[PDB]
């Protein structure tokens, strides 16, 4: 993810 997204 660009940054915090789906794991």
């Amino acid at each position, epitope marked *: 993810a*660009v*940054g*915090i997204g789906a794991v």
Partner: antibody
Amino acid sequence: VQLQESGPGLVKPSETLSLTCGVSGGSISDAYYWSWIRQSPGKRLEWIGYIFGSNGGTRYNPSLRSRVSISIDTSKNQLSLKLTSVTAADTAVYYCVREGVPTEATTGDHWGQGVPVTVSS
Amino acid sequence: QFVLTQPPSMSGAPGQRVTISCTGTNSNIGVNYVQWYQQFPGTAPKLLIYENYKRPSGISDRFSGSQSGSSASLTITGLQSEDEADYYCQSYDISLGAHVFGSGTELTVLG
């Protein structure tokens, strides 16, 4: 694609902190992870949880899962955070973040400016 | 309780090549992506690296990111005073079911 936070600068202990994030330049329904991030004094950063724009399914940091709720208002293009039973441990700066587009030339994340919430009697 | 720890402070001269390390456990860096965030005085964190090494557009090419096993690293080649900021690695912790941030490293540029 910008974001901004509204909310009471002060909240009383055991009461419920409520925050709003307004989004401009992009839709809140989009298939994105909208996270609430808090930064305590001492500059420690904590991820509270996120909500996915399309389904509205949410996932919370288990350390706070009971006290938290994150939701979406499609008509206002809005994101909302509620944290109950707050103590001095929740005085912090609060941001809303969207992960941002997954493309070769992305600008990256999108962060609000952050609203400082102080918990005090 | 920090599952991602970084040296609290790091110092380097202009032009020098410096690196900020991030030490994690098997359940976050060992198996998950790491992001690197930069934060200036009074500023929201600025995403610098995602998926261990990818730079978003606009990020200077002097920044590079690596990851192996359960450790990650951020490298500034050609240190600039413009780079004086706080740096955080960030990953996902499976054991704790939550996204986590490092202790942060305050980078100061001498000269």
